[PDB]
């Protein structure tokens, strides 16, 4: 099973972004935001 964290590496988003995402999303770029949302479902884990 994959993890939302692993995805960040693939999209080179940021360890802080996905980390704070569950706390207060405000560091993810609009473009990277849409890509993550889609990539989040693929792994089955959206949180």
CSV table of N, CA and C in Angstrom, one decimal:
chain,number,residue,atom,x,y,z
A,1,UNK,N,0.9,-1.2,0.0
A,1,UNK,CA,0.0,0.0,0.0
A,1,UNK,C,0.9,1.2,0.0
A,2,UNK,N,0.5,2.2,-0.8
A,2,UNK,CA,1.3,3.5,-0.9
A,2,UNK,C,0.9,4.4,0.2
A,3,UNK,N,1.5,5.6,0.3
A,3,UNK,CA,1.2,6.6,1.3
A,3,UNK,C,1.2,8.0,0.7
A,4,UNK,N,0.4,8.8,1.3
A,4,UNK,CA,0.3,10.2,0.8
A,4,UNK,C,1.7,10.9,0.8
A,5,UNK,N,2.5,10.5,1.8
A,5,UNK,CA,3.9,11.0,1.9
A,5,UNK,C,4.7,10.6,0.7
A,6,UNK,N,4.6,9.3,0.3
A,6,UNK,CA,5.4,8.8,-0.8
A,6,UNK,C,5.1,9.6,-2.1
A,7,UNK,N,3.8,9.9,-2.2
A,7,UNK,CA,3.4,10.7,-3.4
A,7,UNK,C,4.1,12.0,-3.5
A,8,UNK,N,4.3,12.7,-2.3
A,8,UNK,CA,5.0,13.9,-2.3
A,8,UNK,C,6.4,13.8,-3.0
A,9,UNK,N,7.0,12.7,-2.7
A,9,UNK,CA,8.3,12.5,-3.3
A,9,UNK,C,8.2,12.4,-4.9
A,10,UNK,N,7.2,11.7,-5.3
A,10,UNK,CA,7.0,11.5,-6.8
A,10,UNK,C,6.7,12.9,-7.4
A,11,UNK,N,5.9,13.7,-6.7
A,11,UNK,CA,5.6,15.1,-7.3
A,11,UNK,C,6.6,16.1,-6.7
A,12,UNK,N,7.5,15.6,-5.9
A,12,UNK,CA,8.5,16.6,-5.2
A,12,UNK,C,7.8,17.8,-4.7
A,13,UNK,N,6.6,17.5,-4.0
A,13,UNK,CA,5.8,18.6,-3.4
A,13,UNK,C,6.6,19.2,-2.3
A,14,UNK,N,6.6,18.5,-1.1
A,14,UNK,CA,7.2,19.0,0.1
A,14,UNK,C,6.8,18.2,1.3
A,15,UNK,N,7.8,17.9,2.2
A,15,UNK,CA,7.5,17.2,3.4
A,15,UNK,C,6.7,18.0,4.3
A,16,UNK,N,6.8,19.3,4.3
A,16,UNK,CA,6.0,20.2,5.1
A,16,UNK,C,4.6,20.4,4.6
A,17,UNK,N,4.4,20.5,3.3
A,17,UNK,CA,3.1,20.6,2.7
A,17,UNK,C,2.1,19.5,3.1
A,18,UNK,N,2.5,18.3,2.7
A,18,UNK,CA,1.6,17.2,3.0
A,18,UNK,C,1.5,17.0,4.5
A,19,UNK,N,2.6,17.4,5.2
A,19,UNK,CA,2.6,17.3,6.7
A,19,UNK,C,1.6,18.3,7.3
A,20,UNK,N,1.6,19.5,6.9
A,20,UNK,CA,0.7,20.5,7.4
A,20,UNK,C,-0.7,20.4,6.7
A,21,UNK,N,-0.8,19.8,5.6
A,21,UNK,CA,-2.0,19.6,4.8
A,21,UNK,C,-3.1,19.2,5.8
A,22,UNK,N,-2.9,18.2,6.6
A,22,UNK,CA,-3.9,17.7,7.5
A,22,UNK,C,-4.1,18.6,8.7
A,23,UNK,N,-3.2,19.7,8.7
A,23,UNK,CA,-3.3,20.7,9.8
A,23,UNK,C,-3.9,21.9,9.3
A,24,UNK,N,-3.4,22.5,8.2
A,24,UNK,CA,-3.9,23.7,7.6
A,24,UNK,C,-3.4,23.9,6.2
A,25,UNK,N,-4.0,23.4,5.2
A,25,UNK,CA,-3.5,23.6,3.8
A,25,UNK,C,-3.4,25.0,3.4
A,26,UNK,N,-2.2,25.4,3.0
A,26,UNK,CA,-1.9,26.8,2.6
A,26,UNK,C,-0.5,26.9,2.0
A,27,UNK,N,0.1,25.8,1.6
A,27,UNK,CA,1.4,25.8,1.1
A,27,UNK,C,1.5,25.1,-0.3
A,28,UNK,N,0.3,24.5,-0.7
A,28,UNK,CA,0.3,23.8,-1.9
A,28,UNK,C,-0.2,24.7,-3.0
A,29,UNK,N,0.6,24.7,-4.1
A,29,UNK,CA,0.3,25.5,-5.3
A,29,UNK,C,-1.0,25.1,-6.0
A,30,UNK,N,-1.7,26.0,-6.5
A,30,UNK,CA,-3.0,25.6,-7.2
A,30,UNK,C,-2.7,24.5,-8.2
A,31,UNK,N,-1.7,24.6,-9.0
A,31,UNK,CA,-1.4,23.5,-9.9
A,31,UNK,C,-1.1,22.2,-9.2
A,32,UNK,N,-0.1,22.3,-8.3
A,32,UNK,CA,0.3,21.1,-7.5
A,32,UNK,C,-0.9,20.6,-6.6
A,33,UNK,N,-1.8,21.5,-6.4
A,33,UNK,CA,-2.9,21.2,-5.5
A,33,UNK,C,-3.9,20.2,-6.3
A,34,UNK,N,-4.1,20.5,-7.6
A,34,UNK,CA,-5.0,19.7,-8.4
A,34,UNK,C,-4.3,18.3,-8.6
A,35,UNK,N,-3.0,18.3,-8.9
A,35,UNK,CA,-2.3,17.1,-9.2
A,35,UNK,C,-2.3,16.2,-7.9
A,36,UNK,N,-2.1,16.8,-6.8
A,36,UNK,CA,-2.0,16.0,-5.5
A,36,UNK,C,-3.4,15.4,-5.3
A,37,UNK,N,-4.4,16.2,-5.4
A,37,UNK,CA,-5.8,15.7,-5.2
A,37,UNK,C,-6.0,14.4,-6.0
A,38,UNK,N,-5.6,14.4,-7.3
A,38,UNK,CA,-5.8,13.3,-8.2
A,38,UNK,C,-4.8,12.2,-7.7
A,39,UNK,N,-3.6,12.5,-7.4
A,39,UNK,CA,-2.6,11.5,-7.0
A,39,UNK,C,-3.0,10.9,-5.6
A,40,UNK,N,-3.7,11.7,-4.8
A,40,UNK,CA,-4.1,11.3,-3.5
A,40,UNK,C,-5.1,10.1,-3.6
A,41,UNK,N,-6.0,10.2,-4.6
A,41,UNK,CA,-7.0,9.2,-4.8
A,41,UNK,C,-6.4,7.9,-5.3
A,42,UNK,N,-5.4,8.0,-6.2
A,42,UNK,CA,-4.7,6.8,-6.7
A,42,UNK,C,-4.2,5.9,-5.6
A,43,UNK,N,-3.6,6.5,-4.6
A,43,UNK,CA,-3.1,5.7,-3.5
A,43,UNK,C,-4.2,5.3,-2.6
A,44,UNK,N,-5.4,5.8,-2.8
A,44,UNK,CA,-6.6,5.4,-2.1
A,44,UNK,C,-6.7,6.2,-0.8
A,45,UNK,N,-5.5,6.8,-0.4
A,45,UNK,CA,-5.5,7.6,0.8
A,45,UNK,C,-5.6,9.1,0.4
A,46,UNK,N,-6.6,9.7,0.8
A,46,UNK,CA,-6.9,11.2,0.6
A,46,UNK,C,-6.4,12.0,1.8
A,47,UNK,N,-6.5,11.5,3.0
A,47,UNK,CA,-6.0,12.2,4.2
A,47,UNK,C,-4.6,12.6,4.1
